Design a protein around this nucleic acid. Structure first.
Ligand SMILES: [Mg+2]
Ligand SMILES: [Mg+2]
Ligand SMILES: [Mg+2]
Ligand SMILES: [Mg+2]
Ligand SMILES: [Mg+2]
Ligand SMILES: [Mg+2]
Ligand SMILES: [Mg+2]
Ligand SMILES: [Mg+2]
Ligand SMILES: [Mg+2]
Ligand SMILES: [Mg+2]
Ligand SMILES: [Mg+2]
Ligand SMILES: [Mg+2]
Ligand SMILES: [Mg+2]
Ligand SMILES: [Mg+2]
Ligand SMILES: [Mg+2]
Ligand SMILES: [Mg+2]
Ligand SMILES: [Mg+2]
Ligand SMILES: [Mg+2]
Ligand SMILES: [Mg+2]
Ligand SMILES: [Mg+2]
Ligand SMILES: [Mg+2]
Ligand SMILES: [Mg+2]
Ligand SMILES: [Mg+2]
Ligand SMILES: [Mg+2]
Ligand SMILES: [Zn+2]
Lengths: 53, 203, 86, 122, 50, 118, 158
RNA sequence: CGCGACCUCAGAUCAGACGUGGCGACCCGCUGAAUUUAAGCAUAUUAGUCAGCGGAGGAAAAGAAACUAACCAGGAUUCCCUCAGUAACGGCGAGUGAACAGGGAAGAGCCCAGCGCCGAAUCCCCGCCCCGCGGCGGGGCGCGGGAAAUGUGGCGUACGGAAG
């Protein structure tokens, strides 16, 4: 499909983040917390949520 | 606070973190169009120290001025006159490309007012500037006392009288002994005060 | 065959009455007025002719709104009031 | 007789429109008299009938728009014919409330450090 | 031109109604300085523009 | 779900009608081209009354913004007579001269004696 | 083409000078406008000094003029602090302040501190609401006799 | 695959607003010549002038020092007298040419971002009640909707400031 130019842009930007040599300061955010640790951290942080208005 | 780290991080620009960031942003900004709205500032600390408080009614644009000097807009060669004014190709323009950026941003939006602007990227053939714009007839702007100065008719199109910071850098003013040819209101006012006979009544 | 016998072919006209300035200067092939530049949003005006300025500035025509705003300014734009009746 | 816009004002809407209607009829009959060639009385009278139509229509439009702004008295958005039509910059001028708003910095400065009332012995 | 447009014909209608002379009950007025219609126009001599 | 045609086209979205919180102009403007202002006076020329006698028409001077249908309904409301047809022109003075052919039911010399022209 | 003997000179009329010539026929209209404005301001600040605030002894800078004392811009912060006057209360009770002035001597500082104490002796501060006097307000005997002094308040002569 | 967040971005005759254009004497930004003078002329001069273009206001701009100074030191900006046809520039030819200081007109100072500490303490909009309404504003109630943590408000700004 001839995609729109914004769809083309936001896809091939991610292609460039796969291509270019990403420095480690920006690389460290693709190494992320795995799923069964993230869900127990969120069920801990659900206890301490700030107050609704 | 985070903004101190953000300003020192933006200060280090040949650091490969910031070379990667400015390169990828500049790629994306060339793929985009010339005068398009940015949804939020790219440099929030620079925006906040130039005047942007992230409330309703402030608008960031992201504009692309084409990079280069200024060749003289004459037919083929042919400036018909004395050999001082023969030159066309190596001429430079009196105002910064940052000011030209604020100018065409505030021309494209005439209902808004150019607060200030900053730098985001460059390459060989374009420079990119993000412009801060205040909508004066919004009431979060009009009911706040220390920003309802923008809502007055004197401040109409600041970028074209040359009153934002990128325009003030090109008028040659400021205190000093370096700035004698603007004393008075401006350079033209200096010249006009100097080249008039004050022919008194009693001489 | 340059003069009198070439003034005979003058039968198809160039300009016509413009519809912003009322003068017969609206060109038909360029379709722009010569005295005011009609399809431009801005009135054609130059400083090398102060006489072409003074032929139509604010004072020339009727000032159908602006003389009324002058005599409203001399009482400072009162609205909603009437004088007290008899 | 001599129609006057003093006593056309309590007159209600359909009665004013019937007055307008037979004034229009009378003006058209006087115009036919003008074309066929009538008398100086009717040729004088057509001005009286035209200004009669004028002040009947004046009373109609005034009494309509008085009711319109009395209908839109309390409301927040009201039509552009009913808004105050002063000059454009004077409508885009800030309000006498909004230009009276002072920040709390200068509220407290005007509290603590008021302008004083002094005089100097010579 | 018998193929007139409406604006042209309207303009010509105004000029030929303006082309009438002075009414003779004017030159007995008190503050008068008029003796004829100076702005007249004969169709051979002056060609009206357009 | 699949895309067969390789052209992306804009998704058809929902657009509401105006629900304005106040009318722009308050009261609608009165019809200034009404049935009295549309026809002004009839002609009483020798040609016009030759046509009243022979062709069973009346001859009127109406204003330029008229229609044939408008002055047809005008003569029908002002003089209570129906109209066969209407033929209009713009005089060189600037007015719109109309020729109102009545029905064979009615007679224009009678209606002219009614409305004064003779 | 000069004559026999005479000063050869450079008149600066080679430009277009007639288009830019400022003639002074509104000189006396300007003087009357200024003194009308001066009378209006001097009566609208009604017991306060017409000359404005008080301004310090300060000494002219250079080698040509350092023997001369003028009236300056405003009292320095060091001077106000030694005279006890708060830097925001001074502008209200009638004292001019500038924050930019240094003090590199002691003679000039003691002159200005003495001048501030002399001013606080001389001034008559009316109460804030007149029916309710307060502590730092002058007495009702001299509240009636307070008036505008014309000329510069405590003039500086050399 | 579907659902739900957020992010980038579109369409609305969506609700409410706003800019366009004119005059243009004075003002701000840019562009900007050649006549003319040099007894020619090319650098200069005319001249940052005319013409061109954009933008305002009742005045505009400037303005509270990354200043002047070199003194026993002055102290925002603007204007006037003077400095001074001086220092200086210039085929050092013709021509060009400021500022400091001093005397006067006037006189006024201030606010952010950052560093912080306060449960976002903040702002806009819809609906109803009361008041006032021809500068749509004040008070109350909404388990009303948004903005905002990618930072609003309060204290605080180089004259230091905050906490105890
Ligand atoms: Mg030359
Ligand atoms: Mg610079
Ligand atoms: Mg042609
Ligand atoms: Mg123009
Ligand atoms: Mg002929
Ligand atoms: Mg001789
Ligand atoms: Mg809408
Ligand atoms: Mg020469
Ligand atoms: Mg010569
Ligand atoms: Mg020559
Ligand atoms: Mg030059
Ligand atoms: Mg010009
Ligand atoms: Mg404009
Ligand atoms: Mg104006
Ligand atoms: Mg100003
Ligand atoms: Mg100075
Ligand atoms: Mg001398
Ligand atoms: Mg030489
Ligand atoms: Mg020069
Ligand atoms: Mg000086
Ligand atoms: Mg004085
Ligand atoms: Mg603050
Ligand atoms: Mg904050
Ligand atoms: Mg400072
Ligand atoms: Zn035209």
């Amino acid at each position: 499909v001839k995609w729109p130019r914004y769809i083309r842009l936001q896809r091939q930007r991610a292609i460039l983040y796969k291509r270019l040599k990403v420095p480690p300061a920006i690389n460290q955010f693709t190494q992320v917390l795995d799923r069964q640790t993230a869900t127990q951290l969120l069920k801990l942080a659900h206890k301490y949520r700030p107050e609704t208005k | 606070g985070a903004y101190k780290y953000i300003q020192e991080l933006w200060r280090k620009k040949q650091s490969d973190v910031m070379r990667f960031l400015l390169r990828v942003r500049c790629w994306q900004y060339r793929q985009l169009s010339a005068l398009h709205r940015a949804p939020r500032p790219t440099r929030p600390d620079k925006a906040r120290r130039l005047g942007y408080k992230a409330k309703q009614g402030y608008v960031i644009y992201r504009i692309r001025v084409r990079r280069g000097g200024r060749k003289r807009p004459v037919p083929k060669g042919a400036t018909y006159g004395k050999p001082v004014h023969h030159g066309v190709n190596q001429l430079k323009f009196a105002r910064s490309l940052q000011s030209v950026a604020e100018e065409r941003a505030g021309r494209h939006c005439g209902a808004l007012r150019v607060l200030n602007s900053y730098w985001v990227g460059e390459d060989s053939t374009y420079k990119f500037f993000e412009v801060i714009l205040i909508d004066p007839f919004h009431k979060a702007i009009r009911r706040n006392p220390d920003t309802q100065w923008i809502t007055k008719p004197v401040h109409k199109h600041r970028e074209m009288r040359g009153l934002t910071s990128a325009g003030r850098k090109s008028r040659g003013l400021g205190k000093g002994h370096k700035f004698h040819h603007t004393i008075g209101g401006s350079r033209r006012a200096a010249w006009r005060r100097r080249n008039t006979l004050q022919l008194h009544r009693y001489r | 065959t340059k003069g009198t016998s070439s003034f005979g072919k003058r039968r198809n006209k160039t300009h016509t009455l413009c519809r912003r300035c009322g003068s017969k200067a609206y060109h038909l092939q360029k379709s722009t007025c010569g005295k005011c530049g009609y399809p431009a949003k801005r009135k054609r005006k130059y400083n090398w002719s102060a006489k072409a300025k003074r032929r139509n500035t604010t004072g020339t025509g009727r000032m159908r709104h602006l003389k009324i705003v002058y005599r409203r300014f001399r009482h400072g734009f009162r609205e909603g009031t009437t004088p007290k009746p008899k | 007789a001599k129609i006057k816009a003093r006593d056309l004002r309590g007159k209600k809407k359909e009665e004013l429109l019937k007055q307008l209607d037979d004034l229009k009829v009378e003006l058209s009959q006087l115009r036919v008299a003008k074309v066929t060639g009538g008398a100086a009385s009717k040729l004088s009278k057509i001005r009286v009938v035209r200004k009669s139509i004028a002040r009947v229509l004046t009373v109609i439009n005034q009494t309509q728009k008085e009711n319109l702004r009395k209908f839109y008295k309390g409301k927040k958005y009201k039509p552009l014919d009913l808004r105050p039509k002063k000059t454009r910059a004077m409508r885009r001028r800030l309000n006498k409330h909004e230009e009276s708003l002072k920040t709390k910095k200068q509220q407290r400065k005007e509290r603590l450090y008021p302008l004083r009332k002094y005089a100097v012995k010579a | 031109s018998s193929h007139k447009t409406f604006r042209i014909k309207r303009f010509l209608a105004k000029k030929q109604k303006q082309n009438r002379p002075i009414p003779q009950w004017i030159w007995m007025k008190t503050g008068n300085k008029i003796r004829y219609n100076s702005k007249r126009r004969h169709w051979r001599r002056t060609k009206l523009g357009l | 779900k699949i895309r067969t045609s390789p052209t992306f086209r804009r998704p058809k979205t929902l657009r509401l009608r105006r629900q304005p919180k106040y009318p722009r102009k308050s009261a609608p403007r009165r019809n200034k081209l009404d049935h009295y202002a549309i026809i002004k006076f009839p002609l009483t020329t020798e040609s016009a009354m030759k046509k009243i006698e022979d062709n069973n028409t009346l001859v009127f001077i109406v204003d330029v913004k008229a229609n044939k249908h408008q002055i047809k309904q005008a003569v029908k409301k002002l003089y209570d007579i129906d109209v066969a047809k209407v033929n209009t022109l713009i005089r060189p003075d600037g007015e719109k001269k109309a020729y109102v052919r009545l029905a064979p039911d009615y007679d224009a010399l009678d209606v002219a004696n009614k409305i004064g022209i003779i | 083409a000069p004559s026999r003997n005479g000063m050869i000179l450079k008149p600066h009329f080679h430009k277009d000078w007639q288009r830019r010539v400022a003639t002074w026929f509104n000189q006396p209209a300007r003087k009357i406008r200024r003194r009308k404005a001066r009378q209006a301001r001097a009566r609208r600040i009604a017991p306060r000094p017409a000359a404005g605030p008080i301004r310090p002894i300060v000494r002219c800078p250079t080698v040509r003029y350092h023997t001369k004392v003028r009236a300056g811009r405003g009292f320095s912060l060091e001077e106000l602090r030694v005279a006890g006057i708060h830097k925001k209360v001074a502008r209200t009770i009638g004292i001019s302040v500038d924050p930019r002035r240094r003090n590199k001597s002691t003679e000039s500082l003691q002159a200005n501190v003495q001048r501030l104490k002399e001013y606080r002796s001389k001034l008559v501060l009316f109460p804030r609401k007149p029916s309710a006097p307060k502590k730092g307000d002058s007495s009702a005997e001299e509240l009636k006799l307070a008036t505008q002094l014309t000329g510069p308040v405590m003039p500086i002569r050399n």
